[model samples]
Target: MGIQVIATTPFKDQKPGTSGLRKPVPVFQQPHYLENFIQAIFDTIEAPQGQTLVLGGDGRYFNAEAIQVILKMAAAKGFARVKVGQNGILSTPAASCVIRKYGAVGGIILSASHNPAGPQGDFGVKFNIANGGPAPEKVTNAIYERSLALTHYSIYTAPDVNLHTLGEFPLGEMIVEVIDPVADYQALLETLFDFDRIAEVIRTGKLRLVFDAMHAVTGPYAQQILEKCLGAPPGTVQPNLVYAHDLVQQLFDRNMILGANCFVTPSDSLAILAANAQLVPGYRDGLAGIARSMPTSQAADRVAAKLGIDCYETPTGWKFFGNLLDAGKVTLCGEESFGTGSNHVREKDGLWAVLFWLNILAVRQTPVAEIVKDHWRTYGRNYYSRHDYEGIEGDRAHTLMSQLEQKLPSLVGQTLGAYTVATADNFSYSDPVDHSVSQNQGIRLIFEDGSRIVYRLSGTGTGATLRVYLERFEPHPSQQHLDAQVALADLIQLANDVANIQSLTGRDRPTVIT
Candidate 1:
């Protein structure tokens, strides 16, 4: 279907107020009112090419319907992906996590946030940036400025996406990624606490807790966690909708980055966390060092250089960083699976990264995307991606590695694209404290822009997997916003050419990407 450039008159009643506009159903039901505000936001941001936007609502009176309108518009506007919750449901805090972790440009939450709901109740809308916090005053003012003068809105002519399902489908070219409200959030909580011990307390009657959902967006999370994970009886809890009253006063509530340029690359985020280390209360004492995988972007190294601290270039594994953590040699450590960690505990804590960024966002009071943009203005960005081809025959995968391992001699000093190759090598590392040598990490080609490509092969219980990581550094903020694919297109071909990937694996494109 084609995009609709529908004509519309500006409505005086519509406003982008305080991260949202709360209106009674009657007013919102006015034709094109919701579309006008939604379109205003799209226009204000200019909806960058190939970006992901998050969409979800409180499941209030108009929420289900509003989502279909927004989804159609999101498709019309050229979003690469839209991570919506299944059945258009999302709690405020829950939506924030998805926005931050998935690297959405910014997200539109359809709930009024603790306000009344229903046919005559309050329905509100708010926008949160990549940092997954409320849009700043500067943003709201601009949205209102655009809203007042709006005349038309863009929409895709399409059937309603199945809100009842959880998975990816397309509305035009944009991927509608319907996500689970509980799984991701719950996974992070599991990493943070002891599930077994908590279950014992609740199951044994030692701790009697009443967790209420308010019959709203938080209901799904309650079902999985209270009833399933912790073994609390179903009657003990219920969730964040209108009737959420007098169960009383009890309740509470990355990644991987997303928002207008909402997601940050692993290298970029690690650099961001370290650069703003002082803002977090726990690590305010001062960071000792930062560790990044060899294939990770040099952006963090730049931050460490400026901070007068050591930035270790370790092999690509979480456990490898443990040595540095044990020595207290590294206070902050990260590898590019979009992971960052503080020394709070060993395994990379998903929510720790989430909490740390939230701390920074809270202290700095800036949107996540802005914090990242500002970081780029100061230290440049490492535009990056990891391309993976899965289920290759083990024999072919081994030869692919063998093919590159033999080429290190002459792979150096060759010019493939605009950039000249400075060096090529098979990386190996020596543990500083243990003196154990971790050898044959990745076959890499470092380019003139200080950009690089790493071809790493791994074996699973099943078929062999091959990964090629491409990174190109954009030193100027003006040049940094292009999508990673277009920005590094030449490197994409160059990696394939050097690795003989197409000949060996027969994959025309990536199966999994990061």
Candidate 2:
């Protein structure tokens, strides 16, 4: 207490958006910028004495330095304990798991999340509540409010703790633990998977695997769980798409799944997991319910119907599902942004999805393509696709969406491109647990036969991005074989026509189509 000192800090609207506070690395590097945000969070959260805080980052350029700063702040704020990752390297999912598993007051994750890294790239700070999910909008709003009026922050001055070690050290009155993030994450995974059976498949060389680490935080996780424990060939964890040109070329080669890659829609993957949940050790007792973001296809909806369980559609973000999971209303949740997760942890885990697919392979003994095809034959196919128009002028982006949202009121019951619009609305969600309402999540045009076209705008890129999602349900097995872009060719053009993409945004084609 005698060592504590208060200092003035500053912020320029350090308000956390849907993601957390992210800006150019230079912004975070600015003096007192990071300090101000951390103090604002501490003030908003009002962590009681003796509370614990989980903290870590993806080991980006400023990660270690930022952790040291927060360490002093947390110590001065009277937290009794803080568990940080060794070397400040912790995946986002692991940070969430650590918070819930250890029952911390909350957590701080330093990641821009798929944003670029290195000195020039972005840096972020996301605070996850005690439920092991990112802070809900209410909490983020309060923190932003605190940031606007905040002036002074306190710190416990001391030499930095050795972050490379995996043990506890005292920083002021707080016990700071330089913990191995991999161990806790791995142990949680083991309980949900059949490791020995998976090991047998690996040893027999029945299933070959390659984990692209993307040169990020999950590499150590893969190294520990895949190579060291599961006996993968050395260097199985290659780098990512831009760097791992070898794996990219391998998929395009003949006899090696020759131009023969299996592409499963995110909705189909979510549906398949639900349809086969009984095959998984963790979900063997059957699921309580299912949830999907508004833009995700209705594939999981059909599965929920068959299983006689509830299905929820919420706005994007894990916090929406966070409410459902905490209330025990949903067992699994998914989004079209290529994310999937269950009640096991509040955030999505890429490796968990990988292990889930592998577990499915172990039990079913079916090829990835074949298993997905089988699921389609049983539940029909939700031919889903996403189109991203990136870096459009921010003002124009908003204008395009605003005009479309206005047009939605009159578009219902209109027929265009061999489809009749049965409903059109700007999507909104009310949390069943807390009754919190989130509006304007996306724009939806739904057809009578269950085909859909949606528009979601994101401003995180260099400019802004408009994402159009299309989905067509094919009940006839004969029609499911066509490529998704081809299958939705008419609707894709119809979307451009309805939204006036070329005229409004000055772009004829999307920057990326996925």
Candidate 3:
């Protein structure tokens, strides 16, 4: 068919959200739907006539279809080239790497992070500027203005382009390069971390871990990073399959537990969960099959006791560990979320974490349990637990937060038994490495005695998971004994009641308690 001239339709409203232009999947399925925004993106930017551009998505249902439409339009718009993920799947961080690695003009990232799968759930699209950050307000405003009345879009009578074969191909003078997804990422990781040492640790069987892909986009990446790079045995990283939703949910019901019970780590923020456990011999297999981020340090602590390496605990996020890692005060970090790694790569690395533990074990020939215990003995102990209340009412949740923020000062001097509010505020972070300020990451209420209650709504979730983080520091000489989870149980209730979260959101107990 010849180029079709669809009449111009005036664009409407367009604005990016906290992360990106997130919306339900149906919004992206409209006729010429994806094209309207793509054209506006080209029109808004000041690209030289035929400069190269990179593009990719998180491998959701509409990824390929949208890429096809965007590709044709880019070619028609006179873009020199476009780089996409090999199989229409790129992790959010990886998309940033590709843009910087190849020096492309910018990038178009298609993702609705942690949103439910299937056509009925949600879909997203966004443009990243040259620096790989989300387009700022001014740029987005321009795109929105153009989208209000976008008329023309470009396309060609090009043959079907191949991305599945994992090889480079051509499309109408544009070089379609399909590079190995893991290779470039691995090289980048090596620079930020010492993979060889980590691998040695794992080979000795002293460092054991479990990586849960959450049945989302990280499945394949997790497998390659864990088994091939870290040298984990088979079944170390389970459910290495990515689909619309979490297939792992069927296999493991971690989310079904209460936050006061299991480990909790909100997607956009950090939380801590750990315990001193006496593992039974029969459960050794089960213990090793745990989710990768589920406090391997606790297990490592046992190993550290023999090896004489120290372990330190932080809230969550690779960013959280920045303060301790950069100070050379600590090494080897972890969290309960499906993310792990050290100051390596300046971000949480799934594969790197696996390798780090392996290398430590192989070189030292120390028992894993000894390594974990030594860490505790040196840094003392941080009894931590996180509670999550999912799918909460936005208004009610905000109101609860407002109340808590307002009451912080008054609650300071007023002691509730041995606990006294030492200080409290919404958690704000200044990136020690990059000096970037992250305000309102979460809300924290600290007790003078080193116990804390932190509350915050998650930025990325299929629904809101009201994450509550609790921490208590214990010294060896103090001789303290308190159940980490039980200690925070009462506060969990108070937190819920303070905001009446359950009634407002209509969620009966948390969907996943950990």
Candidate 4:
């Protein structure tokens, strides 16, 4: 068959977004559809067949079938070898790591990222350049240009090969290896985290926690690392029906689509996961330190209240906790937007957090609750949380952001009640390891009282989750009962008035109030 365009038009809006191009599965189900795009990619990018190509997906709806088809084309095109993630599932970042680790020419990651799963929800595909970053604008544009007239594609017709085992198989002239996707990534994660130390933390029972795979890709890793390695009670690890049944289906539906249902029911995820902590000795005994999505600070704070501990709220990204975590600044952390992690990994790790807490309790010389009580007494308290509003109009959102950036200076030194804007800037960071510059991370407002309000667009959402992170340090242990939500509410009106966010975006309230 000739090129089967995803849409009737060959060049129907195919460009990678923050992560990739996520569309309905039918869009990718067209005749010669995937083949044409693959051919166009090869045609636009000059590379020898003997060069490496890393291919994998998040194991969404059509992942397996698509990979099988793409493999035929890769073989026909003379690729030297193809390294694929097992079960055709690779998280976006994990795929990047794989490509660079293996020294591949480039990599194709198939994920909609936090988008819903199933054939009806959305399917996506993206190409990452050899640098392990998303293909640059020039290359994506060239692929788009080539897709316009692509009428033919080549593929090798051959018998199905068993990829259940790990090793190399010859496909005519090219070599193909079906790798254990988790192995390489897990190894990398091991290097980035102090697993043994965290394991000790769990063994001592200094901390107790819960992890919900949400039936996504991290189930096995959670089980392997948390339950088996860290020795958390079997019930400590909460696996939903999705994790127990078809993980692919679970993960697909588990996309951070609606914000609330992203974690199964609409009930507060912080509370749900926190409630599970009762199963662990530390949490059961009422000693737990909480960290959640900057937006979910309120709920995490509630958990802290119940446990008599401290709560930490951070921006949307898991990378924010790197410094605090490395410095042993936090024991557990999560996000209201359905993303959470801990001090174990340099980055927030789904499995690492659970294992870390488990290890903390396992080796703890004291009760988890008591450990946290002492921690709070020493560190004082920074009550924090973030509020996320998703599905906003893109233009209006940008305008609000522009307003904040342009008016940063004027807002500084302005006081609202006891809180004054001590510092305000668009959040920026430099990679501690490589010293890479990452700017505009999010808009941040620092108060003279040490509280903060951060407004940022959710990187992977249909709309931005404008995060308002409120924090205040209290020396009076007696005032630990202060209401964080109420304290930050006063500034909302001023922030809206100053930033013109509500008027400009026409959003009175957030879609998901974490």
Candidate 5:
């Protein structure tokens, strides 16, 4: 088969956001729209000739088609071999694991993360560099520039290879290998966790666990590792379902876990994991350091302090942690957006986090409520909540953010309601390892009591999403038991007043709160 160099025009807005390039499926279906961006990636990366690359997606709509297209392009672009996931499926973290395990040039992950699916839903593509991390700003900027001036893309003129089967096949001059996606990632998990201990907990009926896959990626991955390998009950795993509510039910029924309507904020989850890291084999020795996004609460910071390790803060994106992790400056990192990971891989692993908690649960021999309450008793609790105003006009969102940014410096000494502002700034981070700077990450206001309110425009969605993060530190165990929303009610109101969110967005309440 011969290579076909098709002429194409640039899409002016192929710029990657915090995660990747996400668009409506129809937009990606446009003529050479996906091609242009893929070519831009090829053009921006280091010499691609005779290199290997990993390819996979979250098994959403159009995942298979996009995988085939990317394979054809990789073949024509002179890649030596492509290690693809079976049936075009691989969780975002799994793709990262595959990239590092096999020493591939990089990987392309097709996911909107938590976005909805189907024809009307979203689609995305993100390129990871060889270190199993998202491409840094320099590389993404180059890709964006190339996307704007791209004139053509190359693809091999070959029929689509069957991604269903697992084997090597020829794609022009390049080789395509469809491998079992779950095996390598599962192996990685086993190495990090004590399977014998976890399996004993499961086999001895000491713990009743439930794994929810949420109808996307991480379904089979969880099942294979948690159920089959860990010897959990056959029906303990459920795919295509989110288990947060289920957890709530379990907690409510099982010993008033935390309190009625109790939930684990992503921020606390990271902290709790750090506080109990000794229970998990992978982190038994101790973490070198910890890292969390700026918007994430200081809960993890408290844990780091208690552990006598450094806690680093970066911007909202995982890419920011790439340099820190690669330099071995941090062993664990997380975000407020339901992301947590360690040096195991570049990307956050959902299943890995779950397994860590499970291992902890097994070793501690305590209920979930007790663990949380004890953690609070030791390090105190950081009450946190995020209110999202979704689908606001882009211009209006920008206006709100701009006003907040302008008022940051002046708000330092002002008293908003019952709290006195101690300091304020638009969060900016200069990476310690690489010295690269990322500014305007978010607008933050710190109160005298270590409380905070943050304002930022979320870049992960299609339309405008204004996120307000409200947090207050409660050092007293008596005060820490209050509901998060109730505990942070003052800060929540302060956040609303500081940003004039109601007047700007014309919404009295957020569209979603978590």
Candidate 6:
């Protein structure tokens, strides 16, 4: 069939957010909604003729349908080739790996990243550049502008192509390359880690690996690398479970004693990984530097200080770290929002982080809890937690942030409870390499005692989500074992009082605390 350009209209709410353009499934199902946005993406990048384009997703609801539409559109818009994951499945990190490994022009990722699936849940699309990182703001903003001005979109008249098997097929004049998504990603991991050593650890029964893929894109990945290649016994890698508690209970029911507490906060996890980077072959020479989002705890900063490396802090978004990683300023980076990765690929890799820890465990011959506790013993611990107030009125959320921003200047030198403010500001970041400035990232109050509370509105949702990050640094190892909530209870109250969260939102407690 030949290409056809169908007339269309623009949707006002097409701007990409912190991660991507996310909306309810129904919003994406609107007539020409996805078409317009995808076409605008084409328009923004100038739809380079004959350049390779990678496509895949988290295998969420409507993923297959969206893939078909995107594939046909790619063919119509002149992408020479499309490398898709088998069965339309590729985790966020896997897609990034594929893009860089194949030297594609860029990739389109379909995911809502941990958001619930099903018809009523969330759906999204993100465009990544050739370097295998999320498209910078310049590109995303251009796409948004094109989206608002969009009047039509192009597509091939052919039927949906098969995405189950690995092979090549012709879609119009473009070739669609179906690939085994796990293989290349697994290969990438092998280059970064000593798979043989990890396998040996498993064979000797000295290490027990319990991986939970949460029934998501990493299920097959974990199974392939941890079980098949590593010689781990059957049922070692659990599928279809998300939370650590679920994984712990499942392993407990099986009578397997892994460790006392394997669960770790995202902020601490980054620091721990940085502290132990020498165990993995990829970082055997040590990291050039490290980076974390602004709202994240300063735990990694401590680790970087010890390592004599720079620890760059960016605003809350993965895109902000792209320049740093590309400039070789950082080898490892993470976020408080359950994200971690390195220069291996642009996006955060869940399985990559898991395997990084496993590699460390194999060499160190220590329990996960012990490794974390030892890190705290050496560098101390930053007790951290995030409180989320979900589904608030948009106006209320803005008013809350605006009020906080206005009060920031007055907060410095003031005493709140027992803590004295050392500094206050609406966080701003100037990229060291690119010199791009990002303002109004978040409202932060830093106490003279090394405690901090940051208030910001979450950008990943359609409705408003206010996130309050509370953290306190403890230099004494004895105080590190206290419950995180109990240790930071004073800071929690301080956050609420400073922001007037209760009176503003009419909610005494956060909807979710993590």
lDDT (tens digit, per residue) of candidate 4 on 1-514: 3222233347576655444566678877877667667777777556646788888876667888888877777777778998887777666556666776877887787766533422346777877767565664567778777777765666777765556677888776778788886777667656544567655555544333433323333445555655576454454443232211122122222211111111221113344345345544333444346655443435345446666766655544444444444445455666543444433222234444333333344444443334344444544545554556666776677778887799898878888676788888886665443355567767777777656667877544355546555555554566554455664566665666777767887778766543
Off by over 4 Å in 5: 114-120, 205-218, 239-263, 391-418, 459-464, 503-505
Q: Rank the candidates by TM-score, best first.
A: 2, 6, 5, 3, 4, 1
Query: Could you arrange the candidates by lDDT from highest to lowest?
Result: 6, 5, 2, 1, 4, 3
Question: How far is 380's C-alpha from truth in model 3 (Å)?
Answer: 3.4
Cα RMSDs, all models:
22.3, 4.0, 9.4, 9.8, 3.9, 3.7
TM-scores for every predicted model? 0.51, 0.89, 0.67, 0.65, 0.89, 0.89
Per-residue lDDT over 1-514 for candidate 1, one digit per residue giving the tens place of the 0 to 100 score: 7798998988875655543787777788889888888888887666468788888876778888899999999898898989898899876656766776777788888876433322246778888776665665567777777778988999999888997878899788889999887676666555544456545544444222311112221255556665666665555433122111111112210111111112344567788889998865566678989998898888898899999999998987655676787688999877775366666544344445544554465456545555666787788777788898988988888888897889877867877767788878889999998788888898878887778888887754448889888888888767767767888898888888878899988988899876
Question: Model 3, 37-139: lDDT tens per residue?
Answer: 7878878667636666767777778889887777767766666777777877666556656766776777887876533322445778868766544565567
TM-score of 2: 0.89
Off by over 4 Å in 6: 114-120, 204-218, 239-261, 391-407, 413-417, 459-463
Clashing residue pairs, backbone N/CA/C < 3 A, model 5:
215-240
lDDT of 6: 0.81
Error of 1 at 416 (Å): 2.3
Best of the candidates, lDDT = 6
How good is model 5 by TM-score?
Answer: 0.89
The weakest ten consecutive residues by lDDT in model 2 span 252-261
For model 3, what is the C-alpha lDDT against the true structure? 0.54
Pick by lDDT: 2 or 4, better one:
2
- State the C-alpha lDDT per candidate: 0.71, 0.78, 0.54, 0.57, 0.79, 0.81
